[model samples]
Target: SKGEELFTGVVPILVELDGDVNGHKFSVRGEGEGDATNGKLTLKFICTTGKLPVPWPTLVTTLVLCFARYPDHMKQHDFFKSAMPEGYVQERTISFKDDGYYKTRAEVKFEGDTLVNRIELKGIDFKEDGNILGHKLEYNMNSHNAYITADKQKNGIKSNFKIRHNVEDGSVQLADHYQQNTPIGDGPVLLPDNHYLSTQNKLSKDPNEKRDHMVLLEFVTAAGITL
Candidate 1:
């Protein structure tokens, strides 16, 4: 097994992100490479906030359109087991306009396999005018473990939360008084949530046999969000 490429035989790898935002549903799905290269990715955002009765898709066409367009920044989600830099960091800013009314400015930072993706919104006329919004979102998958955080602000107050799932046990700590011993699958386990955050993971085994390895990330509000 020595010197054999781990992902050589693995092709058509799939990556997905599905969750709810403020009671609205959003999903993004894509497939990429094992040879340390970027691949095509697609996304869809559905919401029932306008005059239309049915949920409508957002104006962004692809994942790249939602982020800065550059080669070094394209495949940040590839998550190759063989091609992760220990101390690399990259940052970019992206701007998007929706219906010519609201403009979104996203500040993205990548530190090795960890990403701090933040977004801020404002009116097209350069005025707040009750049109400004802020979102806190981040993710990381490294040699040690995987983690994600999502938060929203309301009425000048911020609700911050996080979920961390270990690849190798004991690499991190679950919140005090929220620890549990329940296993999800294979070697993965769950940590109890205090009505704000939850974490779970599947086995992080070799890719020789298994085709799908996953870690479940969840954030619960009065309306639940799961990915």
Candidate 2:
């Protein structure tokens, strides 16, 4: 069934973030989404500290840039675009099937040339009701990258996941390791099977310096999403 169509309609939704990084507290809120052709997501990291850190602004800007590139990647999938009807609008809900007790609702919208997308899940507690999971994504025509941020709490344990994609190069970087953690720009790790053509490390600027802790990979074709 994995090869079958997984989504029918797409829409954008709002997302808020209030979390800490290495003991530094920060809050961010923004919206983005994707459709059949393009997508765009954005996050505005507010300055919570009395003084802004050296890398906070730049890092946040880079993250936003990455988010803007996502819709372009989604456009690569014909199945994804086929679900979206022409002249679609925001604040609309789409249907999705689920296994066991899970259910999902999603939306997509357009902001000029960008796309904003959002999805919410329910029934994670194994009951027939209740909201349990959330996923927010954004993409834009200006950049060649995309991003997603997800958080979950179960049995008193909390987990967060972040993903960045380089649409042009078909590179994907994931940040979710329960037992082990890997920083961004660390270079590509082995992805399941050989879906990717190649994987490598990405640098902020100087290759001689340490990696930015993000990995990059190339897709064999533009239809890479089918894999």
Best by lDDT: 2
Cα RMSD, each candidate: 19.7, 16.7
lDDT of each: 0.23, 0.25
> Residues 84-132, candidate 1, lDDT per residue (tens digit)?
1121111112122221132333322223333222333322322222111
Task: Report the number of the highest-TM-score candidate.
Answer: 2
**lDDT tens digits, residue span 1-227, model 2:** 12112222233434333333223344433443322112222223233333322222112222211111223343332221232222111111111123112132324333344433332322223213311122111121112222122111211111122324223234332322121111122222212111111112222223552422211211111223442
Off by over 4 Å in 2: 1-10, 39-193, 196-227
* Candidate 1: regions farther than 4 A off: 1-38, 42-56, 61-99, 123-227
Candidate 2 lDDT score relative to the true structure: 0.25
lDDT for 152 in candidate 2 is 16
